[PDB]
Amino acid sequence: DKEWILQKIYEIMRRLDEEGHGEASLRVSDLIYEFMKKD
Amino acid sequence: NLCPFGEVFNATRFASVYAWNRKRISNCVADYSVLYNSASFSTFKCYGVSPTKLNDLCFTNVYADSFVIRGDEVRQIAPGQTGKIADYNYKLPDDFTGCVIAWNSNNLDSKVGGNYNYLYRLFRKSNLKPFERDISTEIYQAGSTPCNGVEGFNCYFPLQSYGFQPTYGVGYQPYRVVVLSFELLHAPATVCGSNS
Numbered sequence: 336d337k338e339w340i341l342q343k344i345y346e347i348m349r350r351l352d353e354e355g356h357g358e359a360s361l362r363v364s365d366l367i368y369e370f371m372k373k374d
Numbered sequence: 375n376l377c378p379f380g381e382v383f384n385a386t387r388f389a390s391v392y393a394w395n396r397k398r399i400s401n402c403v404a405d406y407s408v409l410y411n412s413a414s415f416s417t418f419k420c421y422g423v424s425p426t427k428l429n430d431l432c433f434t435n436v437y438a439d440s441f442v443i444r445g446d447e448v449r450q451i452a453p454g455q456t457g458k459i460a461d462y463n464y465k466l467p468d469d470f471t472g473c474v475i476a477w478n479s480n481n482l483d484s485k486v487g488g489n490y491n492y493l494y495r496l497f498r499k500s501n502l503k504p505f506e507r508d509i510s511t512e513i514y515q516a517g518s519t520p521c522n523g524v525e526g527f528n529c530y531f532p533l534q535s536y537g538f539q540p541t542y543g544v545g546y547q548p549y550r551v552v553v554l555s556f557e558l559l560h561a562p563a564t565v566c567g568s569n570s
């Protein structure tokens with residue numbers, strides 16, 4: 336179901352961190368946690 | 375015979391929250407008013423006990439649990455809280471009894487170019503039990519495809535690092551937490567405040 340979307344969301348925050356935007360990488364982390372709890 | 379809290383509060387290196395650090399405190403007295411009235415604390419939530427009668431009370435055992443988290447997540451270091459930290463890194467029980475103390479350590483734990491010494495766990499197949507510490511580093515299988523122990527597609531390293539930088543907003547800046555547990559169980563009670 337969400338198999339593809341997760342990977343791509345994960346990749347975002349990983350990329351953002353690489354580009355320096357740490358607060359934004361952390362705000363995506365937060366959203367991945369919330370996204371995987373949402374049943 | 376003083377309780378060594380400086381080793382906990384005034385300590386040099388703190389633990390990442392997923393591998394929080396626990397110090398046992400027994401057989402000593404403790405001026406708590408020093409802590410409450412050193413007033414260097416963005417947080418001092420206490421539960422099942424009043425932070426002013428702490429000098430009056432005694433307890434069987436004290437534990438001092440310490441670690442770093444960003445400032446947003448400090449709200450989760452309280453009983454009953456859900457969220458990425460209270461779920462996967464450090465959980466407090468409903469019947470908690472003790473205090474929770476945090477202070478901003480932007481000066482200490484932020485670096486230009488990001489400070490990566492501090493990790494958190496983002497993935498976990500289920501919520502932490504209270505005081506459970508999961509320092510595992512297995513690759514997290516998120517989808518139906520085996521990870522064979524290597525990162526990949528829906529196969530993520532479960533620890534993500536904070537990126538502490540001094541130029542973060544106050545919510546993204548590192549906080550040092552100290553959670554004191556006041557164990558009152560059937561025992562002589564060896565840890566006492568400054569007053570009997």
Ligand SMILES: *[C@@H]1O[C@H](CO)[C@@H](O)[C@H](O)[C@H]1NC(C)=O
Pocket residue numbers: 379380383384408409412
């Ligand atoms: C840590 O040191 C400061 C001053 O250096 C002191 O005011 C504080 O009480 C100390 N912490 C403890 C737990 O004694």
